[PDB]
Write a protein that binds this ligand. Sequence first.
Ligand SMILES: Nc1ncnc2c1ncn2[C@@H]1O[C@H](COP(=O)(O)OP(=O)(O)O)[C@@H](O)[C@H]1O
Ligand SMILES: Nc1ncnc2c1ncn2[C@@H]1O[C@H](COP(=O)(O)OP(=O)(O)O)[C@@H](O)[C@H]1O
Ligand SMILES: Nc1ncnc2c1ncn2[C@@H]1O[C@H](COP(=O)(O)OP(=O)(O)O)[C@@H](O)[C@H]1O
Ligand SMILES: Nc1ncnc2c1ncn2[C@@H]1O[C@H](COP(=O)(O)OP(=O)(O)O)[C@@H](O)[C@H]1O
Ligand SMILES: Nc1ncnc2c1ncn2[C@@H]1O[C@H](COP(=O)(O)OP(=O)(O)O)[C@@H](O)[C@H]1O
Ligand SMILES: Nc1ncnc2c1ncn2[C@@H]1O[C@H](COP(=O)(O)OP(=O)(O)O)[C@@H](O)[C@H]1O
Ligand SMILES: [Mg+2]
Ligand SMILES: [Mg+2]
Ligand SMILES: [Mg+2]
Ligand SMILES: [Mg+2]
Ligand SMILES: [Mg+2]
Ligand SMILES: [Mg+2]
Lengths: 288, 288, 288, 288, 288, 288
Amino acid sequence: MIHLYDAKSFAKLRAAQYAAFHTDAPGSWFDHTSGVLESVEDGTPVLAIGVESGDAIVFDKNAQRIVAYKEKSVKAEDGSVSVVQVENGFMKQGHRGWLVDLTGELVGCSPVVAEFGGHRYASGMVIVTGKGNSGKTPLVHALGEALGGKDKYATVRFGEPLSGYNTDFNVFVDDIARAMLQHRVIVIDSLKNVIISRGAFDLLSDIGAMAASRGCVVIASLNPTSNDDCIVELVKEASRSNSTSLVISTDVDGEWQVLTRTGEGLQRLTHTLQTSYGEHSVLTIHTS
Amino acid sequence: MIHLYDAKSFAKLRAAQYAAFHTDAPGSWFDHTSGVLESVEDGTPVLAIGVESGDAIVFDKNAQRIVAYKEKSVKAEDGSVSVVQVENGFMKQGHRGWLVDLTGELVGCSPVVAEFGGHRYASGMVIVTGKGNSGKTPLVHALGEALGGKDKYATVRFGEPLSGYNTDFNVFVDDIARAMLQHRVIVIDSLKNVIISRGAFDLLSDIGAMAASRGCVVIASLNPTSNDDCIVELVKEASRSNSTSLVISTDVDGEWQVLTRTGEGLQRLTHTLQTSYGEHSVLTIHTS
Amino acid sequence: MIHLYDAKSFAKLRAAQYAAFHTDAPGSWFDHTSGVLESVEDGTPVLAIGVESGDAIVFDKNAQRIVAYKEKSVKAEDGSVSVVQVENGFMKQGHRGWLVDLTGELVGCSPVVAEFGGHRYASGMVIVTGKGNSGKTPLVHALGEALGGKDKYATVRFGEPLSGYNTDFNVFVDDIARAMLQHRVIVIDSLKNVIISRGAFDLLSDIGAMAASRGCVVIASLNPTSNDDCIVELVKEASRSNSTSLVISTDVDGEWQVLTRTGEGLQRLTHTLQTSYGEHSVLTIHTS
Amino acid sequence: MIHLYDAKSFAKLRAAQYAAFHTDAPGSWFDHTSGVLESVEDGTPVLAIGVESGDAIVFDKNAQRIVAYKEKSVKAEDGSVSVVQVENGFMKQGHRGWLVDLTGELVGCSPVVAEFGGHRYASGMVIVTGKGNSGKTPLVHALGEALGGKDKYATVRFGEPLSGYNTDFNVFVDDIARAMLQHRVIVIDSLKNVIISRGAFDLLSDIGAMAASRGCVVIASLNPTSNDDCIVELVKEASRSNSTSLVISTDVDGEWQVLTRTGEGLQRLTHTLQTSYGEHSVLTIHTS
Amino acid sequence: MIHLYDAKSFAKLRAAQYAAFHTDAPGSWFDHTSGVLESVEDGTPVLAIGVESGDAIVFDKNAQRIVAYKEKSVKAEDGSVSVVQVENGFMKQGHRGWLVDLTGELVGCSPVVAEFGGHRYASGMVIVTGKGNSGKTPLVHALGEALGGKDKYATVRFGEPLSGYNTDFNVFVDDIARAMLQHRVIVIDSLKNVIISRGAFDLLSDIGAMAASRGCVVIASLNPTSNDDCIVELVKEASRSNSTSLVISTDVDGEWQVLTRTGEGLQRLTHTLQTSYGEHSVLTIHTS
Amino acid sequence: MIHLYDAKSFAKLRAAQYAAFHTDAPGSWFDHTSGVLESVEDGTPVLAIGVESGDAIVFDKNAQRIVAYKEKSVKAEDGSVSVVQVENGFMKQGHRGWLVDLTGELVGCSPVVAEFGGHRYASGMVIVTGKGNSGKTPLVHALGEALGGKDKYATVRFGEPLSGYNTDFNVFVDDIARAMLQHRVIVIDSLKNVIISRGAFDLLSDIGAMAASRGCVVIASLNPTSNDDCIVELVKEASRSNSTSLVISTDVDGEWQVLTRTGEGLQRLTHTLQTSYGEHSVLTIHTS
Ligand SMILES: Nc1ncnc2c1ncn2[C@@H]1O[C@H](COP(=O)(O)OP(=O)(O)O)[C@@H](O)[C@H]1O
Ligand SMILES: Nc1ncnc2c1ncn2[C@@H]1O[C@H](COP(=O)(O)OP(=O)(O)O)[C@@H](O)[C@H]1O
Ligand SMILES: Nc1ncnc2c1ncn2[C@@H]1O[C@H](COP(=O)(O)OP(=O)(O)O)[C@@H](O)[C@H]1O
Ligand SMILES: Nc1ncnc2c1ncn2[C@@H]1O[C@H](COP(=O)(O)OP(=O)(O)O)[C@@H](O)[C@H]1O
Ligand SMILES: Nc1ncnc2c1ncn2[C@@H]1O[C@H](COP(=O)(O)OP(=O)(O)O)[C@@H](O)[C@H]1O
Ligand SMILES: Nc1ncnc2c1ncn2[C@@H]1O[C@H](COP(=O)(O)OP(=O)(O)O)[C@@H](O)[C@H]1O
Ligand SMILES: [Mg+2]
Ligand SMILES: [Mg+2]
Ligand SMILES: [Mg+2]
Ligand SMILES: [Mg+2]
Ligand SMILES: [Mg+2]
Ligand SMILES: [Mg+2]
C-alpha cells in the first residue's frame, strides 16, 4: 500500500531498513514470514505467479494450487482494497505477488538471509553472471550450500539439455512458488530459457520482490547468451536492475565479486570471493 | 474544452498562468482543488486511470473504486458533452484523467506546489534521473519531505527487488490514484518497470496533467537502463517531454540540477541543489 | 469523385486554384463553407473522424455526435455512390472527412485564410517546427491571434504535463471536430502525444485536407522529440508530407521561415517572420 | 492460367508481345478490352480490388459495386476453375484483379497506350519519381493530357493537405477501379499515403497488372518521403519493381528520363523529356 | 517416414542416390511418378499446398480441387499413420506436400530431369538470380524450352506489371499445383511477390521437395529488390538454402553459372552457360 | 520436481552424475529407460511435444498419438502434483517432455550413449556446425553409424529441396517422437527450416533434455544461413545454449572438434575427429 512519512518517521524506517540487513539475526525474517504464512486460514491464497500466457496461478500456504475461490475483499490500513478470486484454475481477480501482507510497515528491506565467511548476504534475487562460460553452475550450488548453513537448499532446474530438466515454463513457476513457500535458500539453474513471453517478463519483474519479502534467497545462473564483446554489460543491465545482489566473475580464475543492495536507498556493499574445485567439480568457497 | 482568445484575453491568460507559479501562495491550488473535490455530489466519478489493458478504472473523492455507474451526461460551456459510464468495474464511457472540472478557464498552469530554500517548485510530474547509480532514491525522499513541509508525503513503491514492493501494474495505478486524490506531495519509486503495455503508455502520457490539474507534485525516480553512455538523453527525452520538472545529477558529487516548466509558453527556470548524507543514508538538501 | 480534364479545363482549374489563394478575399472560402454547412438540414452527418481504435465518429453541423443514422445514399456526377450510416455511435458506412460537398468542381486549393504583414496565409495544416525547445508554443499563439484578425482563435490543448490538459486521444478528436466546425483559426498544442494509433495515423493523414476543404487553418507545433541532430528533417518529413504550410525556426533568435503551398501543383512561397517577447512570454510577430 | 510452349509457339508469343507495343495502333488494346467488358452479362463481376483491411470489393462493367452474387464457376482452357461469390458487400470467393479474361493467349504485354512526341508509351503503371520536390504534380498532369490525346484523362486524388482531397483508402480504391473501368489515361496524385496496410500492399502488387491488362495507363506521383541522400534508389526499388514504366527527374531543370518495359523479357527503352512552365504552373512537354 | 541404416544399407542408399542424378535415364523418375499417380485409387487426395492463410488446399491426380473428404487413414512401414481429411474446401487433417508415397525407401535424391548440351540437370527447384536487370526472364524461358526437350514446358506467371499476370497468391499456388501434377518442366516468373505471409513462407519451404519428389523441375526467376550491392548473396542465401540448383549471372555479358545439388550429402557440381539473343529477345543457350 | 541438498547429498549427486558419463556402460541408460517405458501400462501417455501452433500432442510407448485421455494425477515425493489430460488429440493438462519418470533422483546427467575411437559420447543433443557448405550431412551420417555400433541409427528428414523430404513441421515432430521412443541413435537433417514457430522454439528448448532423459543422442546439423562472417558464432550461441555436445569444423579439410558436456556443472571435454571420403560421398571417421 501507500505510506506517509515526515522527517522523523522516515529516519525510523531507514534505521529499521538498516537493521534488517546489518544487525538482525541471519535468516530471522524468513522465520518471521513462515509464521505469518502458517497463521493464514485453510485454503486462503498466499501467492500468485504469472504463467506463460500471462494469466496467474494461485497457491496456498502448503504450495497447493487453488482451483476455485469465491471473491473476497480485504481493507488495508490505507483504505486500499485487495480482491482475490480464483476460477477454473486461474486468478479471475487479484494481483501477482504475495496475496497476504508479510512485510507490514517494514518495506524496502534486504533481509539478511545468511552469514558466511564473515559477510552478511541479503535475501532477494541474486544473479550469478559475468564473461562467457567459466563455472556459473558450480558457484550457485556452492552459494546454495554456504547460505543454507544448517539447512538444505532447494534446487529448481530448467531448460538445460541435461537429463531430468524440465523445459516447460508452467512447471517452472510451479517449482519456483513451491521453493519460495517452503525454503530460505533456492538455486535456479538456469534462467537462460526465460530470456520474450508475458510470464517470462513477469518473472524477472516479480521474483526479486517476492523473495525479499519472504526473506528467502534465489540464486540464479545467467550466462550472457550473446557475444565475447560487451553484452556482459547490457544483459547485465537486465540483471543489475531486477537484482538485490549481483555475483560476477573477474579476470582472475576462481574469483568472484559480490555486489549487494542492503535496502531502499542504502549503500551498496562490495566484497570479494575466492573459490577452488575439488573432486567431481564440487566447488568450495574459501572462508578464512 | 476548447477555449477562444483574442490579444486581450490571451494576455490575461498568460498573466494568470505566470501568477500561478510566481506569486500565488505555495500549495494554494491544491487546497482549492480539495474544495472542488469534496463539494462534488455523493457518488460522482472524479478520476479515471488506465490499467495494464488500456481499460480505465474509476474513483470517487475518497479514492474508492466505482463498480457500477448509470450513464450520466454533462453539458460544457463549449456546448461539448462529457459522458461517464461505469460497468462491471470498468469505464464503459468516458476519458482518462479528471472527470470533474478543477481548472475552468484557467489552464496551461504549473501551479506552485511548495516553497523551499528560496525556490518555488511546480506541481505536476517531476522526473529524477541522470548518470546511473548516483543517489536517485535518497533524493526523491528528501525532495518529498522538503516539499511536504508541514505535511507528510506519500510514497508509492513499485518494481524493485526489495521487501514489500508491489510489482503488479494494476495495483500501482490504484496507488497512484489514491495518492493524487489525497495528498499534495507524492513520491514514486520507481518508474523503472513502467518503462511497453498500453496502460504504461497511458500513465506516462497522463500523470503530468493529472498532477498539475490537482496541484499536487509527483516525484518519480528513473534510472536509464539501456546504456551507461548516451541514453542519459534519449530516454531522458521520454522524460523532459512528459515532465513538468526535471531533476538531473551533475559532474559534482551530491549536486543536482532542477529544470522547471513554469507554465504554458512560459520560460523554463533552472537552479541547483547541494546535498549530503546523514546516518542510515538519510539525505539533506542544503538551504540558504 | 474523379474529375476529367483536357488541356482547356485543366487550364481553367489551375487558374481557379491560383485565384483561391492569390486574389480571393481572405476568409471568403470559410464563409462560403459556413454557408453550405448551416444550410444542411439538421440531423445530417457532416464530419467523420477516426478515434484511437480506428473506427470513426460522426458529427452534425453543431458539432454534436451522431449516435444513430438510418442508411442514406447520394449519387455523384461521377456516377459513384456516397453512403452514410451510423449505428451505436460509430460509422457503419462511409468515409472519414467531410460528408457533405463543401467545394464543388473546385479541388486542390489552398484557400486563402488570412492576410497579415503583407502576406497571404493558406488554410489547411500549418506545422510549426525546428531545432529543440525554442519558442514554438509562443509562436502558434502569436500566429493564431494574427490570422484571427477580427476573430478570436480556437485553442485545442492535448498531452502536456500542464494543468487542465486533456491527455485522452478520443477527447482530442472531439475538440478538433468542434473547432473546425465552428472557427476559421485553430491552434493545437501539442501534436506530440499523437506522434501511433490507427486514429493518430488517421488524424495525421486527414487533418490537412479537412482544414483546406473547410477553409480554416490548423496551427500545430511539432517538437522533434527524437534527436538534437539529424532527426530535425525525418520527422519534419512527417511534416513536409501532410502540411499545407511549414513554419520553421532559423539559427537567428526570434526569426522564422514560412513555407506555403499555394495549391495543387502551384508554386511554394517562402517568407520570413520577425518576432519578439513582451511581458509574460506574449510574442509579437513584427509588421511594417 | 498456366500456358505451355515449345520453341515455335514461344517465338510467336514474343513476336505478338513485340507487336503489342511496337506496331499496334496506340490505344487499340484499351478499345479491345472495352469490347470484352461490354460483352459481359448484366451484374457479372469484372473486377475485384482489395480494401484497407485486405478484403476485396467487387465491381461490374459499369463500375457499380456488387453487393450479393450467388456462387458461380467457370472452366478455363487449362482445367483451371474460377469461383466468384460476393456476400454482404464483400467477395466471399474469388481472386483480386480482373475476374474476366481480357488478355487470353496474349499475356505479358505492355500494350501501347498512346503515341506522343515521336515516342510510344506503354499502358500499365507509370511511377513519376526522382530526387526531392521539383515538379512531380505538374508533370503527371502534363503526361495525362499528352497521352490522353483526343480523350480527356481521369484524375484520382488522394492524401494531400489540399481542398477536396479524399484521404480514406476505401474511397481511393473505389476511385481507382472506376477509373480503370471507364478511361485509358489515369492520373493518381498521390501514392504518398499508401506507402503499411494489407490493402495498400495489395494495391502496389496489383495496379500495374490490372492496367496493363486493360490497356490503360496509370500515372502516379511518388515523392520519396525519405532523405536527401540515397532512398531515391530504395523507394525507387519498390518502384522499378512494380512499374511498367518509370519517369525520373535528372540534374537538369525541366528534364526527365522515361524508362519503359515493352513486354515480357523484351528490351527496356529509355528516352528523354524536356518540359517548361507556362502560366499558373501548367507544364508543357516539348514535342519537336 | 523415418528410415534406419547401418554401414551397408547406408552405402547402398548413397549409390542409389548417386545413380538418380548421374546414370538414371533423364526424365525417368517423372515417368515413374506419373505411374504412381494415375494408378492411385479414384478420388484420393494426392497433393496439399498452402494458401495465403497458411491453410492448405488439396488436389487429386487430375489437378482438381478436393472439396470434401471423409477422414481416411494409412499405416506406414514405420508403424506411423498418415491422415487426410478435407472439409468446406480446406484440409482439416493432413500435411503439406504429396499425400501419396512417390519415393518409398528412395529418398534424398535430385532425380535427373533432363540432359542438355552435355550436362544433366536436376529436378527440384531452380532459382535464377544475380546482379539486377540482367536477363532473368529470357533465361528461364530458354532453360524451359531446353529442358523440356520433346515436351512443352509450363509457364506460371505471377506478380509482374504486365498484361495477363495474376497477382493473387491463392491463384498462384493453384497454378503451381497444376503444373507439378501435369508437367516435367515448369517455369515460374516471378517469385518477386512471394518474397511475408504464412503461405509464401510455406511455398518457399515446400516447392523444392515437392518438385524433387515428383521428378519435375521448377525454374523460378528472382531479382533481389533490396540492394544493387551486397544483397546479391543474403537474399541469395534464402535461395541456395531452398534451391536444388542455382543459376547466377556473371561478370561476362550473356554468361551464367549453374550450381547443382546432385543429392543428399553428395557433391555440388558447377558448369557454365553461354547465351545470345535472337529476334524479339528470344534467347538461345549454346551447346557443344 | 525440486530437489534438496546439503554438502553430502550434493557430493553424492555429482559423483553419480560423473558416473553416468565416465564409468557407466555405454548405452546402459537407454536400456534402462526402454525398461521403464515398456513396463508402463499401455494407454499411458509417455511423451508430449509441441506442434507448430504451440499446443502439444501426446504419444504412448509405441509412438501412437493419444486422442482422448481421462484426467489423471500423480503426487511427487516433493508434494507437487503431476497431471495429464488429453482431449481432441491435444494436451488439455500437463507439461511438454516426458510424462513418466525415466530418471529418479538422478538429474543433470549426460548419460553415456556410445563409445568410439577411444572416446565416450554423450546422449542428448549434438549440433554439427561451422563455416558454410563444408561436409555437414556426410558427418552426421558418419557419426550416426559410428555411435549406432551394433545398432542401426534412425534418420529424420526435414526441409531440404530433395526427393521424399517432409517439409511440414507437424509431421517433423511426429518423426522425432517416434525416433526418441524407439532408437538410441538419431539423425536430423536438417534443423534449417526450424531455425520461428512457437513449436520450433519449443523443439529447440526441449529436444536436448528429452534426449538426455531418454539416453538417446540426436545428431542435428546447423548450417549458419545468415553470413560468411561473424554469424558463425551467434547462431552457434543458439547452439552452445541448447546443445549437450557440439561438433564444429576447423580450417583443416576433413577435421572436426567435438565439445562435450559431461553433465551438470561438470567439465567440458574436447577431442578431434579425422575423416575422409570414400565412394559416393560416404564419410569415415578415422579410429586407431
Ligand atoms: N574441476 C574443474 N576444473 C576447472 N573447471 C571446471 C571444473 N569443473 C567444471 N569446470 C567448468 O565449470 C563449468 C561448469 O558449469 P556449466 O553449467 O557447464 O557452465 P556455466 O555454469 O559456466 O555456464 C564448465 O564451463 C567447466 O569448464
Ligand atoms: N551514505 C552514502 N554515501 C554514499 N553513497 C550512498 C550513501 N547512501 C546511498 N548511497 C548511494 O545512493 C544510491 C541509493 O539509491 P539506489 O536506489 O540504491 O540507486 P539509485 O541511485 O538508482 O536510486 C546507491 O547508488 C548508493 O551507492
Ligand atoms: N521572455 C522569454 N524570452 C525568451 N524565451 C522565452 C520567453 N518566454 C518563454 N520563452 C521560451 O519559450 C518556450 C516555451 O514553450 P514550450 O511549450 O515550453 O516549448 P516549445 O518550444 O516546445 O513550445 C521555452 O523554450 C522558453 O525558453
Ligand atoms: N511556374 C513554376 N516555376 C518553377 N517551379 C514551379 C512552378 N510551378 C510549380 N513549381 C514547382 O513544382 C512543384 C509543384 O508540385 P507539388 O505537388 O507541390 O510538389 P511535387 O509534385 O514536386 O512533390 C513545387 O515544388 C513547385 O516549386
Ligand atoms: N535483345 C536484347 N539485347 C540486350 N538485352 C536484352 C535483350 N532482350 C532483353 N534484354 C534484357 O533482359 C531483361 C529482360 O527481362 P526482364 O524481366 O525485363 O528483367 P530481368 O532481368 O529482371 O528478368 C531486361 O533487363 C532487358 O534489358
Ligand atoms: N567426395 C567428396 N569430396 C569432398 N567433398 C564432398 C564429397 N562429397 C560431398 N562433399 C561435400 O559435402 C557436402 C554435401 O552436404 P550438403 O547437405 O549439400 O551441405 P552441408 O555441408 O550443409 O551438409 C557438399 O558441401 C559437398 O561439397
Ligand atoms: Mg550454468
Ligand atoms: Mg532509486
Ligand atoms: Mg509547444
Ligand atoms: Mg505531388
Ligand atoms: Mg524476369
Ligand atoms: Mg546438411
